[PDB]
Each structure stands twice: as C-alpha cells, then as structure tokens.
Amino acid sequence: SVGTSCIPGMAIPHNPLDSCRWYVSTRTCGVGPRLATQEMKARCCRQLEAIPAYCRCEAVRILMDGVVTSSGQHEGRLLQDLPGCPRQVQRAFAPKLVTEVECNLATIHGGPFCLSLLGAGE
Numbered sequence: 001s002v003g004t005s006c007i008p009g010m011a012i013p014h015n016p017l018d019s020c021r022w023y024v025s026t027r028t029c030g031v032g033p034r035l036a037t038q039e040m041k042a043r044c045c046r047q048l049e050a051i052p053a054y055c056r057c058e059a060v061r062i063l064m065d066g067v068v069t070s071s072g073q074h075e076g077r078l079l080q081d082l083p084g085c086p087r088q089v090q091r092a093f094a095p096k097l098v099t100e101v102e103c104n105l106a107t108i109h110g111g112p113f114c115l116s117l118l119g120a121g122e
Contacts, residue, residue, distance in 0.1 A: 006055030006058075008069075011050070011051070012052075012058075014069065014075040015075050016076070017047055017060065017063060017097075023044060024089070024093045028093060031083070031085065041103075048102070048105055049103070049105050056114060057098055057115050063079055065077065098113070098114050099113070
C-alpha cells in the first residue's frame with residue numbers, strides 16, 4: 001500500500017521482543033520465569049539484529065499499540081499491568097532499547113538512535 005517494507009512473519013514475526021518483555025518483569029519486580037538475566041538479555045540482542053534496522057524500532061511500537069494480521073487476528077499489545085509491575089514501569093524501561101543500554105548494534109541511522117528524528121523531514 002504505502003510503507004509496508006520489511007516482511008512480518010518472515011524476519012519480523014508477530015510478538016517481537018518477547019524475551020525483552022519478561023526481562024523487564026525480572027529486572028524490575030524480580031518476577032518472571034526461572035532463568036538467568038544475561039541469558040534473557042542475550043535473547044533480546046539476537047532478536048535485535050535478526051530484526052534488520054529497516055522497520056527495526058517499529059516492532060517495539062507493535063508491542064505497545066499491538067499489530068493486526070492478514071488473517072484478521074491481533075498480536076502483541078501484551079504490555080499490561082503484571083502483579084507488582086504496572087504499565088508505568090514497563091514504559092520507563094521500554095526506551096533505551098536500541099541505545100547502548102540494551103542491544104543497539106547500530107540502526108539504519110548508522111548511530112545510537114531511531115525514530116523521533118528531526119520530526120518528519122521527508
């Protein structure tokens with residue numbers, strides 16, 4: 001249609017950065033499945049590069065606002081108030097992802113940052 005670049009189910013599947021979601025639950029309220037932290041964070045970096053800089057940061061948005069599928073099903077939008085972790089904490093840790101605080105690995109901008117650029121300078 002317009003800006004539909006980057007394939008979804010292939011390269012950028014539905015429910016992206018799932019290990020990052022549970023990683024917020026543990027790093028914030030010490031809650032989450034029984035695993036290690038450096039291991040979860042490592043999984044986020046594998047999903048960070050697997051997701052090419054093209055449409056990269058977009059997925060994070062798909063998690064907050066949620067995405068729709070061609071079949072008519074919805075996914076993501078799981079960022080909710082967990083027992084001891086309100087949407088507020090997930091929103092504070094949410095950013096600083098593509099920056100040197102999570103899995104930056106450089107973006108399309110060839111620098112530590114994405115979106116929120118000059119403000120629609122196209």
